[PDB]
Ligand binder design. Structure first.
Ligand SMILES: O=C(O)/C(=C/c1ccccc1)Oc1cccc(C(=O)O)c1O
Ligand SMILES: O=C(O)/C(=C/c1ccccc1)Oc1cccc(C(=O)O)c1O
Ligand SMILES: O=C(O)/C(=C\c1ccccc1)Oc1cccc(C(=O)O)c1O
Ligand SMILES: [Mg+2]
Length: 417
């Protein structure tokens, strides 16, 4: 009974997202839904929570919070607490802030107290949905009846979406781009990713919007969550880090915006090349000597793969740190790109350009780059999108680029009922 066959015609993304809404319609618990290689893993309810902030580490279990200071690298403090969750559970889920990646580039002192770095939990129940089957882990009657009901009655029809005006520029994106172009021309750095928030003037239904957006996007990974004060969903265009139990580490930097026409394709090839080269240099830090290599370069599958063997003196959190923040969403050289984001972008970035993570007791790690996502933190609903700024960048063209990036979400926002 812990393996229910998936009915034909039932889309796994629709069933998994409906299950998230149904299992929590009365039991107001937190959850995280992660799509990973045809498996939609719904991690439902919080058994234990690890909260890593810039100045504090908290472990919350059975209504009891244990607080402490931490020193050293954030990956080491996070890894130690997550390994402990995983002593008695198979998997842990959560998210990692853009700010988790700053310590490596000497910018930890620039974080305000209470800056979130990571939120990772062990779930009470897991439901895995694929085209093949529905697998249940530590499920009760609530979960089983939710599955039977949805298979018997069907999923809700998705309501009509509500339009949003993304043309506004209250954070001065055009102005911020002009400053970055000047610093690039002055030789400060070669590239920086700058972004802008777009406020959504209505509360959205996250599971319904997730379902609708998922019908018109085919990402590398996707997610839907409600955790602590935060709701979020996204169609991740990049696998920033994957670590297998056997020590094989990969990173798959985004090949372009398509992953006159020659000039634009040439610009994307250059950018991608630089990202792959950066990924290779950084991965070498955690790699067994001679194991780091580009195994797939711009192949149709359009993408690239950088692989390595995890050094026995290294770990999954050091691997994540080595590659964080994603080069795709920071800049070149990385240290200068990250520092320019602290001055030229709305900070803290938090989930935006951070990662949504799935960790396994066997040492596994799957980390998706958070872009093309919607968020809600008490009363505030927003979207966020950016662009790679180079010496030749034009503020108006880059603002239009963010509009194009937003167009994968904007048509699919389902308002709360
Ligand atoms: O999900 C169980 O395993 C469960 C056990 C239980 C309930 C009442 C009394 C004794 C046990 O409780 C529930 C069952 C069915 C639905 C729900 C629900 O919120 O939609 C629920 O909370
Ligand atoms: O090597 C080039 O000439 C080059 C061009 C380029 C960079 C970003 C965007 C578009 C082009 O890249 C770089 C120049 C300087 C430093 C780095 C670096 O990784 O520390 C880098 O990758
Ligand atoms: O816009 C590029 O730079 C890009 C990828 C790319 C990768 C290789 C070559 C060229 C472009 O994607 C992004 C970068 C930063 C922010 C976003 C964003 O949606 O908020 C984004 O889509
Ligand atoms: Mg560009």
């Amino acid at each position: 009974s812990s393996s229910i066959p998936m009915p034909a015609g039932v889309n796994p993304a629709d069933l998994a997202a409906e299950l998230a809404a149904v299992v929590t319609e009365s039991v107001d618990e937190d959850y995280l839904l992660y799509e990973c290689d045809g498996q939609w893993v719904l991690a439902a309810g919080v058994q234990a929570m690890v909260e890593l902030d810039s100045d504090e580490l908290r472990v919350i279990r059975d209504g009891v919070t244990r607080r402490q200071q931490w020193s050293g690298r954030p990956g080491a403090a996070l890894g130690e607490a997550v390994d402990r969750l995983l002593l008695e559970t198979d998997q842990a889920f959560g998210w990692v802030a853009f700010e988790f990646g700053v310590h490596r580039y000497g910018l930890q002192q620039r974080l305000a107290p209470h800056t979130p770095l990571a939120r990772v939990f062990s779930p009470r129940t897991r439901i895995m949905v694929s085209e093949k089957e529905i697998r249940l882990f530590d499920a009760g009657i609530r979960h089983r009846e939710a599955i039977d009901r949805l298979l018997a009655t069907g999923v809700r029809e998705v309501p009509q979406s509500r339009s949003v005006d993304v043309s506004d520029d209250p954070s001065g994106f055009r102005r911020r781009v002009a400053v970055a172009v000047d610093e690039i021309a002055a030789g400060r750095y070669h590239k920086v990713i700058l972004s802008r928030c777009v406020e959504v003037p209505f509360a959205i239904d996250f599971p319904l919007t997730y379902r609708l957006g998922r019908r018109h996007n085919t990402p590398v990974r996707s997610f839907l969550l409600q955790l602590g004060g935060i709701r979020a969903l996204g169609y991740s265009p990049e696998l920033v880090t994957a670590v297998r139990a056997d020590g094989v580490v990969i990173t798959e930097p985004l090949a372009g915006t398509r992953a006159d026409d020659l000039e634009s394709n040439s610009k994307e090839i250059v950018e991608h090349a630089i990202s792959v080269r950066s990924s290779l240099e950084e991965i070498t830090d955690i790699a067994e000597p001679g194991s780091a290599a580009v195994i797939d370069f711009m192949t149709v599958r359009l993408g690239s793969t950088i692989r390595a063997r995890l050094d026995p003196s290294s770990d999954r959190m050091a691997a994540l740190e080595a590659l964080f923040p994603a080069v795709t969403a920071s800049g070149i050289p990385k240290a200068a790109g990250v520092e320019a984001i602290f001055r030229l972008d709305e900070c803290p970035r938090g989930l935006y350009s951070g990662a949504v993570v799935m960790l396994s007791a066997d040492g596994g790690l799957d980390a998706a780059l958070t872009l093309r996502a919607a968020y809600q933190v008490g009363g505030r609903t927003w979207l966020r999108a950016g662009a790679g700024i180079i010496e030749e960048s034009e503020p108006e063209r880059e603002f239009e680029e963010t509009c194009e990036k937003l167009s994968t979400l904007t048509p699919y926002l389902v308002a709360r009922q």
